[model samples]
Target: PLSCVTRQGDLRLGRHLVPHLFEDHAAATPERRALVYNDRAYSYDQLNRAANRIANRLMQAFPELGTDSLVGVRIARSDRLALTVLAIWKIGAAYIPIDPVLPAQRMHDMLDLAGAKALIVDASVAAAEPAVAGMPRIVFDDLVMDDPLLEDNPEVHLSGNDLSYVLFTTGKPKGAMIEHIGMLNNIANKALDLAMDEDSRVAQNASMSFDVSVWQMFIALTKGGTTFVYDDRVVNDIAGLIQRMHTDSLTILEVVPTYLQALVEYMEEHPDCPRPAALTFMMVNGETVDAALLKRWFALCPASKVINAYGPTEASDDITHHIMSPGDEIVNPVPIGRALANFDIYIVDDELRPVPIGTRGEIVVTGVGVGRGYVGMAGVTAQAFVKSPFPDRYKGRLYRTGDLGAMREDGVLMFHGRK
Candidate 1:
């Protein structure tokens, strides 16, 4: 039997939030390289200045923009994407990232749902041109990179409660969900719960369109560490990515299991190819991790720690993590680790009642990590976000993660599959 403890009272702090992670980093390490894109390095100061220029342009074109305004950005992943997001945050507004690959009709639907005040586009995103019919559009390429008039503008005081970015989930009835800056900070801080330092360099393998990229971007920037963005080609070319990783001395890498599996297979065939010595941590998610495949890879990088991260976009990147440890007996497939810092997890039956230990049930998560639900889909949001069954600890409201899992007698929760 599993031991359960209950705490008394509800914990609620109204409007207690802080600034964006990028804003905090810029103040501390102004000259540190915040991002490296296509061989060009952009310092924190340069990135901030660029964001400020775009923010000024946004304000000038749309004078009425304020806290309520939603700005849309249509671009491929680049320094401009980073700048545009920061620029929106600088003005106490949220920016919606519209994927360049999304269908024109879908893009139009998203824009209409967001009711965005202005659309910012990169010259490369062709669909953005025709889709933004009734809104003011600013092509980021045309905007001068020079310092803006408001270079010294008082830092716009923002709280973590403010919406940071809206990530649209993939597939049918596609819904856009809102994640607050505070939720992101909570996730990043918790991710750092695993020991890592300034020398650590992480990979940006996920597309900017995916929510996981948020973790990659923030984890590196907040620590003043380097982040290497993997182009689609590089990702496809596993050999090239591995070569670059060795050259860059990449310390940490995050990839979906499919890519990692392919890379491991490649490494097995080419024992002569050098691997990065600095590499110590690997995080895999988006699909189940194959234990046999990972065990084989571990033989190559014996010192590295492997983590299986699990979470939905509404939970803000990750909510549970299973850290692989040496000297442990084999489990064919490992469980998706324990709940994140400050997050509450539950395995509840179909009726939302807490199931017996070892019983398969839906995985529900609650805490500061829970993001605001689907944008404009009030009905869907209401259905998913509900009061917690464990009332004594959670104070009722929790997110019903449509995932299936069971809690082991040892207290670790094991995921079965998604509902």
Candidate 2:
């Protein structure tokens, strides 16, 4: 028999959330670059002030909105996208980010499911899009930028347990209500585990709707670092991306294994291409990682370690990270590693009992990373985000990953295909 449980040491919950953390950083380093897009840049003070304006304007329009309110954010890939999310959080309201290019019905359905009270949309995408009746639309492009009344951070109260955003990750658009604590824990863990600081620079490469976009856009901000916002064209162009990384001195990047594969292929094809020396960590997720990809990645850029991250959208972003350094064992079916700070990974049986080590079972996640269940879907939420069996050890809800995995004898977690 095995305990089949893995958890980090205790975590003292912080009073401040992401927005508060960001504001503190901004005040400390007003001149530091917070956001950068192709030719545009916003310093820490500039971005925070801009976000405050949006938040104030939004609150004036929808005074009733609070922690319970959900706002739809459909902005083009730019610095505005990052600012919009910061504004939503500053207003003490949650956001549901939808791709500006998604179909009308699908986008509306998500808004409807999340009970979005308002929409913060770009005028570029709003010219022909259908609106959800009764829901106010705040055209991001048409905002009055010179309003001094909206220049200061609003007086909306926020808590660690407040819902921050909802991601419609399920196939049928079931929204997962993620709280500030989950987001904070994930961000804190990533920053600490990756050794990120004020000097680290990350690229915002994920689509607005994807969960990866949250960390990509805000992780650096929490540490007083800069986030380089990439347009779709730049992201899709591997050569262009490599060039930007070199020029910008990007230190950390997180993307799917497929994208990493493409980057490695592009580098191999152009042997003379300049590799980014400052890039210390390259994290790949949303898919399985094989030994071959790691080998190829190391061959091209041995300075950067490849981290295999694994988690569901319901768990903030990632719960485990397996870092593969050059010359390490190229293990097949690469391990997803152990739990991050304030997280727990339990390989359990169908009845929610912990299985013995080396025995395959469902991968269940609990602790700080576990998000609040789906919005307005109690039955569906109960099926997956169940009550933890070991309440004494792991606090709060336990999310059933549904993905088949097993605990190694050494306490590492390995991801198999879905159960």
lDDT of 2 by residue, 1-419 (tens): 57355564566646678888889998899999998999999999999988888888887888888886899888887888888888889989999988888887778788888888888888777787766677778788655376667778775899777899999863677899898988988888888778898998998998877898898899899989999988899998999999999999999988888898889889999999887778989988889878998899888878888888989999899988888899898879899987887777788889988889898999988888788889878889999998887753435688998999988887888988899
Worst 10-residue lDDT window, candidate 2: 3-12
Candidate maximizing lDDT: 2
Report residue 67 deviation for candidate 2 (angstroms).
Answer: 1.1
> What is the lDDT of every predicted structure here?
0.70, 0.85
Please state every model's RMSD to the true fold in angstroms. 3.2, 1.6
Best by TM-score: 2
C-alpha positional error of residue 231 in candidate 2 after TM-score superposition, expressed in Å:
2.1
Residue 415 lDDT in candidate 1: 81
- Per-model TM-score versus the true fold: 0.90, 0.96
Residue pairs clashing in model 2 are none
